[PDB]
Amino acid sequence: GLCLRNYQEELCQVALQGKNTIVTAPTGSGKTVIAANIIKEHFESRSSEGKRFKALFMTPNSMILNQQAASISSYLDHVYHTQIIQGSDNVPTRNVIQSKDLIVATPQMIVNLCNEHRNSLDDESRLDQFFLSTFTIIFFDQCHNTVKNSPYSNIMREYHYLKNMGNMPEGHSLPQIIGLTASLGTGDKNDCLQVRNYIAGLCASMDVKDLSIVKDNLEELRGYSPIVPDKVLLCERSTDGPIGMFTNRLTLMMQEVEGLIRTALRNEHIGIERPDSSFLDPPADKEHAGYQNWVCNQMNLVSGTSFRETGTRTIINEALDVLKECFCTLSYNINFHPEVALNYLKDEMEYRTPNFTVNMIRIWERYHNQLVGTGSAENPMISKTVQYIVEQNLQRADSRTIIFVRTRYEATILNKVLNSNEELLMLGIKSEWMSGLNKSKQKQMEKLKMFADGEIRILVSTSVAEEGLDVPECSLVIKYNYATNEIAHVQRRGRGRSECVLITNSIALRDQESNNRDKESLMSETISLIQNSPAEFRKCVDEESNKIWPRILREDTDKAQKIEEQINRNIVYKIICKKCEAILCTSKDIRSRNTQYLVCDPGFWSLVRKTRLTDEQQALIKYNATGSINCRRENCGLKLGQLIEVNTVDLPCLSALSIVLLVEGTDKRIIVKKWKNILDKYFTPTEIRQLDVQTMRDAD
RNA sequence: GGUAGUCUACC
RNA sequence: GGUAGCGCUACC
RNA sequence: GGUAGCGCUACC
Numbered sequence: 001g002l003c004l005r006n007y008q009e010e011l012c013q014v015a016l017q018g019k020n021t022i023v024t025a026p027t028g029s030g031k032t033v034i035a036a037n038i039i040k041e042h043f044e045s046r047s048s049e050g051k052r053f054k055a056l057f058m059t060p061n062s063m064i065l066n067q068q069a070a071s072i073s074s075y076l077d078h079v080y081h082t083q084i085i086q087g088s089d090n091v092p093t094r095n096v097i098q099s100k101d102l103i104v105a106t107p108q109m110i111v112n113l114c115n116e117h118r119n120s121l122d123d124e125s126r127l128d129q130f131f132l133s134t135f136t137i138i139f140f141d142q143c144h145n146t147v148k149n150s151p152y153s154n155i156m157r158e159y160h161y162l163k164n165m166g167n168m169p170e171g172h173s174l175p176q177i178i179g180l181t182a183s184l185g186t187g188d189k190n191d192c193l194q195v196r197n198y199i200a201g202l203c204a205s206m207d208v209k210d211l212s213i214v215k216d217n218l219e220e221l222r223g224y225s226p227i228v229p230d231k232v233l234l235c236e237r238s239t240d241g242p243i244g245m246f247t248n249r250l251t252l253m254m255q256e257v258e259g260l261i262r263t264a265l266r267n268e269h270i271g272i273e274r275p276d277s278s279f280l281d282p283p284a285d286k287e288h289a290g291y292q293n294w295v296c297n298q299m300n301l302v303s304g305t306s307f308r309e310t311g312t313r314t315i316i317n318e319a320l321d322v323l324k325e326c327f328c329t330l331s332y333n334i335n336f337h338p339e340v341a342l343n344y345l346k347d348e349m350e351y352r353t354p355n356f357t358v359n360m361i362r363i364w365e366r367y368h369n370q371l372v373g374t375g376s377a378e379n380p381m382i383s384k385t386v387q388y389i390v391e392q393n394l395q396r397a398d399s400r401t402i403i404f405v406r407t408r409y410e411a412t413i414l415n416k417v418l419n420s421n422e423e424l425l426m427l428g429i430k431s432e433w434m435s436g437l438n439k440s441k442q443k444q445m446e447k448l449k450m451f452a453d454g455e456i457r458i459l460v461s462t463s464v465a466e467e468g469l470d471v472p473e474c475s476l477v478i479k480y481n482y483a484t485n486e487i488a489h490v491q492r493r494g495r496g497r498s499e500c501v502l503i504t505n506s507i508a509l510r511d512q513e514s515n516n517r518d519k520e521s522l523m524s525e526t527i528s529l530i531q532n533s534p535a536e537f538r539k540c541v542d543e544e545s546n547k548i549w550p551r552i553l554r555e556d557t558d559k560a561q562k563i564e565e566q567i568n569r570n571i572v573y574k575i576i577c578k579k580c581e582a583i584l585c586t587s588k589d590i591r592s593r594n595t596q597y598l599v600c601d602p603g604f605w606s607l608v609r610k611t612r613l614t615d616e617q618q619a620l621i622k623y624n625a626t627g628s629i630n631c632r633r634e635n636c637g638l639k640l641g642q643l644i645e646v647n648t649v650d651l652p653c654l655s656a657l658s659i660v661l662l663v664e665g666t667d668k669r670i671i672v673k674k675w676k677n678i679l680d681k682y683f684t685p686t687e688i689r690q691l692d693v694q695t696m697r698d699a700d
Numbered sequence: 701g702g703u704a705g706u707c708u709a710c711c
Numbered sequence: 712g713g714u715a716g717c718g719c720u721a722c723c
Numbered sequence: 724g725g726u727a728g729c730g731c732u733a734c735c
């Protein structure tokens with residue numbers, strides 16, 4: 001039974017004409033009800049007319065998959081079979097969706113489905129191409145994520161291949177594309193004309209010409225989704241007395257550690273003067289983010305530079321590692337107070353004490369009691385945060401508080417602080433911390449229930465609770481010195497359906513928030529221009545649509561000419577263990593398989609220790625992995641990668657962070673962060689074949 | 701960082 | 712293990 | 724616009 005509202009029916013009109021469209025409506029307006037109605041009309045008209053029908057509904061986050069699948073399925077007759085597909089599944093996708101009418105999927109499942117046929121171990125293993133046009137209608141939930149190299153963008157890439165190459169099979173037609181979103185975003189453009197072009201580009205890439213926007217029933221929409229006021233509350237940042245002394249004394253300690261590096265670089269006769277190429281003087285402002293840019297990029301040079309004396313690499317990597325912890329220590333002092341920041345620093349420094357060098361143990365003893373600095377007052381943001389909690393708890397004993405922070409560790413700290421707060425202890429208010437699941441989901445679900453029952457009344461969370469999760473309506477939303485984009489600004493305040501308040505001690509963070517409100521009104525102005533000058537907008541879409549196919553071909557041509565040139569250079573790279581530098585193999589021995597990079601040198605098995613995973617753990621993991629491999633050399637044991645099952649055979653893949661490249665015939669030490677950087681700059685492994693699988697199955 | 705445009709000072 | 716996006720920042 | 728670093732989240 002469908003009791004469709006009036007503004008919802010308005011949002012179905014374009015789609016019900018069979019046209020591609022994007023549905024823009026606030027979060028909580030019932031877009032999945034709109035989709036369910038469109039799927040119903042699509043299924044019934046086409047079934048009665050004898051035409052084929054098959055729906056696909058995609059959403060980026062797999063946690064609201066059963067929720068949105070059950071919702072849509074409930075509005076449809078039982079003759080229509082619905083099926084969820086996701087990474088936790090073990091059966092191939094091709095079979096699961098064979099006789100299903102509604103597929104509910106994460107978009108990568110469809111990317112792999114459509115690209116699965118392009119690679120094979122041999123000609124007999126080849127698969128028939130699964131054409132995206134097998135679906136007659138496709139829904140992009142949160143379609144503002146159709147940008148750059150995203151899964152959604154790669155699904156539209158398949159669409160445009162079919163649209164321009166004319167390879168669709170007999171009877172097929174281009175599917176109807178429907179997008180759902182609360183806001184398409186401004187692309188951080190500065191005026192309406194540019195934002196209109198940006199939106200035209202997004203439409204073009206989805207092959208959309210007509211936006212679906214509530215125009216008549218605007219008042220009915222206001223009632224069903226109110227306007228929440230977003231207040232900003234700037235707080236004082238203390239730099240007086242103990243707090244400034246802790247900062248000043250930790251700054252002097254870092255300058256001494258920076259001297260350990262310089263004394264070492266002098267012995268190598270290396271002259272100091274970007275920080276990933278040249279050795280540079282550290283920035284004077286130690287707590288500025290530009291300092292971490294220096295420490296981290298410099299540490300890449302230390303493992304990518306060939307020294308000449310003994311221990312130079314050891315003392316520098318020891319120094320840079322301490323400076324990282326000092327920078328984070330300064331960062332934790334901004335959000336809290338020197339007690340917490342020193343607690344972190346003491347633990348980190350005590351952990352490394354057994355291994356510290358001579359010079360480093362001397363420096364720490366000279367500052368460990370000095371940095372103490374007795375004790376300082378509570379951070380103004382904490383006290384102001386507590387004040388907001390008490391003000392709501394007096395008005396309502398059923399008070400639900402959720403606090404967004406930036407880092408996982410900051411949630412750990414703020415949680416421990418709020419629980420040890422005397423005024424909250426008496427007032428009967430416990431707090432729990434929550435973070436992202438990707439690196440137990442049941443231990444997290446347990447916290448959401450306790451938060452709903454009222455056992456815990458405060459929830460310190462990272463940005464995980466901004467989308468997807470079913471978090472109960474909260475009385476107060478606090479953004480503890482944290483802000484990001486304008487799309488989350490519309491969906492971070494959208495969780496209040498209640499007051500959201502930004503507590504910050506940074507003007508740059510207040511400005512970032514006010515800019516995101518300007519972007520919100522800039523969207524309104526632009527959407528109005530689009531609605532009221534529809535012909536000009538159509539011309540913008542046509543201009544952008546004219547660019548897509550030649551751009552796709554240019555991109556494909558660039559990839560092929562890049563491989564062509566790499567083959568003409570014909571450079572061989574030695575692949576060594578990053579820790580022990582034992583030669584693991586060469587680039588000629590690497591093969592690729594589902595964007596995994598496998599060693600196909602049979603001698604490689606004798607350089608590693610396999611470590612299998614139990615079938616219990618494998619079922620929980622949402623990708624292909626059977627175990628790990630570790631460097632076999634003595635006193636190394638570095639994890640070099642993982643085992644993946646290829647046609648029943650375990651094969652070893654290499655982690656990019658566990659290896660270093662050497663041009664064959666030189667000592668040139670190339671460091672790499674990701675395999676995609678290797679494919680882009682050095683060599684492109686060819687697809688793994690059946691011969692390679694057998695050769696490694698036997699050698700093992 | 702590159703380009704286009706404008707301004708200001710100077711031969 | 713691989714990949715995607717977002718924020719901030721550094722250098723050109 | 725390009726080249727990098729950190730943090731966050733997600734996906735296979």
Ligand SMILES: Nc1ncnc2c1ncn2[C@@H]1O[C@H](COP(=O)(O)OP(=O)(O)O)[C@@H](O)[C@H]1O
Nearest residue numbers: 003004005008025026027028029030031032033
């Ligand atoms: N017309 C309606 N009839 C019944 N329930 C509705 C209606 N519109 C919205 N809802 C309910 O509102 C809730 C949120 O809707 P949802 O589709 O998740 O919104 P969106 O996906 O646009 O954020 C759902 O539980 C849904 O059942």
Ligand SMILES: [Zn+2]
Nearest residue numbers: 577580631636
């Ligand atoms: Zn090793």
